Design an enzyme around this catalytic site. Structure first.
Site, short mmCIF file in Angstrom:
data_model
loop_
_atom_site.label_atom_id
_atom_site.label_comp_id
_atom_site.label_asym_id
_atom_site.label_seq_id
_atom_site.Cartn_x
_atom_site.Cartn_y
_atom_site.Cartn_z
N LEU A 81 4.30 -0.82 4.49
CA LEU A 81 3.13 -1.27 5.24
C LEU A 81 1.88 -1.17 4.38
CD1 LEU A 81 4.04 0.48 8.66
CD2 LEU A 81 4.33 -1.93 8.11
N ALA A 109 0.62 1.03 0.39
CA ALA A 109 0.95 1.88 -0.74
C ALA A 109 -0.22 2.07 -1.68
CB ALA A 109 2.15 1.34 -1.50
N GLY A 131 1.31 7.54 -2.91
CA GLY A 131 1.91 7.55 -1.59
C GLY A 131 2.14 6.19 -0.99
N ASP A 177 -13.27 10.16 5.61
CA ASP A 177 -13.08 8.75 5.29
C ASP A 177 -13.02 7.85 6.57
OD1 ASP A 177 -12.78 6.43 3.76
OD2 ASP A 177 -10.78 6.97 2.96
N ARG A 180 -10.90 0.50 8.22
CA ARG A 180 -9.62 0.45 7.49
C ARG A 180 -8.72 1.63 7.86
NH1 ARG A 180 -13.69 1.35 3.73
NH2 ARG A 180 -13.78 3.58 3.22
N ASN A 181 -9.30 2.71 8.44
CA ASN A 181 -8.58 3.91 8.84
C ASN A 181 -8.49 4.05 10.33
OD1 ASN A 181 -7.64 5.28 6.48
ND2 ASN A 181 -9.74 5.90 6.03
N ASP A 214 -5.48 8.17 8.85
CA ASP A 214 -5.99 8.42 7.52
C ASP A 214 -4.90 8.02 6.52
OD1 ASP A 214 -7.44 9.12 5.28
OD2 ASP A 214 -7.60 11.25 5.76
C1 LIG Z 1 2.91 7.80 9.06
O1 LIG Z 1 1.57 8.23 8.87
C2 LIG Z 1 0.60 7.27 8.77
C3 LIG Z 1 0.83 5.92 8.95
C4 LIG Z 1 -0.22 5.02 8.83
O2 LIG Z 1 0.03 3.66 9.01
C5 LIG Z 1 0.53 3.14 10.17
N1 LIG Z 1 0.90 3.94 11.19
C6 LIG Z 1 1.37 3.30 12.27
N2 LIG Z 1 1.51 1.98 12.46
C7 LIG Z 1 1.12 1.19 11.41
C8 LIG Z 1 1.24 -0.21 11.55
C9 LIG Z 1 0.86 -1.05 10.54
O3 LIG Z 1 0.94 -2.41 10.57
C10 LIG Z 1 1.76 -3.01 11.58
C11 LIG Z 1 0.34 -0.52 9.33
O4 LIG Z 1 0.00 -1.46 8.40
C12 LIG Z 1 -0.68 -1.02 7.22
C13 LIG Z 1 0.22 0.83 9.17
C14 LIG Z 1 0.61 1.72 10.21
C15 LIG Z 1 -1.50 5.46 8.53
C16 LIG Z 1 -1.72 6.82 8.34
C17 LIG Z 1 -0.69 7.75 8.47
C18 LIG Z 1 -0.94 9.23 8.27
C19 LIG Z 1 -2.16 9.73 9.02
O5 LIG Z 1 -2.79 9.04 9.82
N3 LIG Z 1 -2.53 11.00 8.71
C20 LIG Z 1 -3.67 11.61 9.25
C21 LIG Z 1 -4.33 12.65 8.57
N4 LIG Z 1 -5.38 13.08 9.25
N5 LIG Z 1 -5.39 12.31 10.38
C22 LIG Z 1 -6.46 12.55 11.37
C23 LIG Z 1 -5.88 12.63 12.76
C24 LIG Z 1 -7.51 11.47 11.28
C25 LIG Z 1 -4.38 11.42 10.40
#
Ligand SMILES: COc1cc(Oc2ncnc3cc(OC)c(OC)cc23)ccc1CC(=O)Nc1cnn(C(C)C)c1
Length: 298
Positions: free
Chosen positions: A29, A31, A35, A159, A163-164, A177
């Site tokens: 999704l 990179a 990571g 951040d 985008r986040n 994030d």
């Molecule tokens: C598995 O972990 C993640 C997955 C992510 O990406 C997606 N997750 C779900 N669905 C998606 C669907 C998509 O397109 C269909 C997608 O297209 C690019 C990405 C998607 C983004 C970030 C993380 C880790 C994370 O948020 N860690 C974190 C650290 N601190 N916090 C605090 C609470 C703010 C959150």
């Protein structure tokens, strides 16, 4: 790396532990250098025999000890925060038998920034799937709600940007994030500043000039996120490169003018988010109460 909480001191509930052999990986999704976030099918995550689509964050073999410690800290923080409607929800993790896998709920519509950019032409300010002002006010409210929750838990995002923010079903936005799963070297929104590649256009002066990140610096970035939201995904300080002239202008009090679709009362929020004095900025809780009033009046 964390201002108030120490994630290394946070526990990891083994209730989250999921067997990695029950994960079937699909497309990447997103990179970065170290990571990635991969779409996966998790078998046996539901009480019935049913499979479900999940998003899995993991490190690449390019990652060092620093990224390894960081992914574990992220997992502890996500486990510590627990489920919140406006935050991406942790479903499980794989810590035993190999590299750390952070498993979250899959968000249907991807990041908010790309969604706003795709919907820029199908936008109606007045009340197919047309994007409206009602949706934008709801997104602003949801992001302020999620951030009010994060600050109550003594968490600083560092951040915050469109985008986040992920968009899922029923116009639900979720703060996430991407961190290490974003190619920040090729992203023009992250500038080279010293040894780092930083999102300077979203950063409070005290974060830029003194490396301090606080509740109030997250509020500043929320102001920038509001600008991106009501400009329908436009880059902040458009036509202005990040250089000496930019840093000078920010320190001297230059601020962006209202984006094209922002109601005056949202722009009022942005101005206060951008106060040079962090003590004069509103809290996310104050922002939630303000937007709530705007929604009720609407
Ligand atoms: C598995 O972990 C993640 C997955 C992510 O990406 C997606 N997750 C779900 N669905 C998606 C669907 C998509 O397109 C269909 C997608 O297209 C690019 C990405 C998607 C983004 C970030 C993380 C880790 C994370 O948020 N860690 C974190 C650290 N601190 N916090 C605090 C609470 C703010 C959150």
């Amino acid at each position: 790396n964390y201002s108030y909480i120490d994630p290394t001191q946070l526990p990891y509930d083994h209730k989250w532990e999921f067997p990695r052999n029950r994960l079937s990986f699909g497309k990447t999704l997103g990179a970065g250098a170290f990571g990635k976030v991969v779409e996966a099918t998790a078998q046996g995550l539901i009480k019935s025999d049913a499979a479900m689509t999940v998003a899995v964050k993991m490190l690449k073999p390019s990652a060092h000890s620093t990224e390894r410690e960081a992914l574990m800290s992220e997992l502890k923080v996500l486990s510590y925060l627990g489920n919140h409607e406006n935050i991406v929800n942790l479903l499980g993790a794989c810590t035993h038998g190999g590299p750390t896998l952070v498993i979250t709920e899959y968000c249907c519509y991807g990041d908010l920034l790309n969604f706003l950019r795709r919907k820029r032409d199908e936008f109606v300010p007045y009340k197919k799937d047309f994007l409206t002002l009602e949706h934008l006010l709801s997104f602003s409210y949801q992001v302020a709600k999620g951030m009010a929750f994060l600050a109550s838990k003594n968490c600083i995002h560092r951040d915050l940007a469109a985008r986040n923010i992920l968009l899922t079903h029923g116009n639900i936005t979720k703060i996430c994030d991407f961190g290490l799963a974003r190619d920040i070297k090729n992203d023009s929104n992250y500038v080279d500043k010293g040894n780092a590649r930083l999102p300077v256009k979203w950063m409070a002066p005290e974060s830029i000039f003194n490396s301090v990140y606080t509740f109030e610096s997250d509020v500043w970035s929320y102001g920038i996120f509001l600008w991106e939201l009501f400009s329908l995904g436009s880059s902040p300080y458009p036509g202005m490169p990040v250089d000496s002239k930019f840093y000078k202008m920010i320190k001297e009090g230059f601020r962006m003018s209202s984006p094209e679709y922002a109601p005056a009362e949202m722009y009022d929020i942005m101005k206060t988010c951008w106060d040079a004095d962090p003590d004069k900025r509103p809290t996310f809780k104050q922002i939630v109460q303000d937007i709530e009033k705007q929604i009720s009046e609407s």
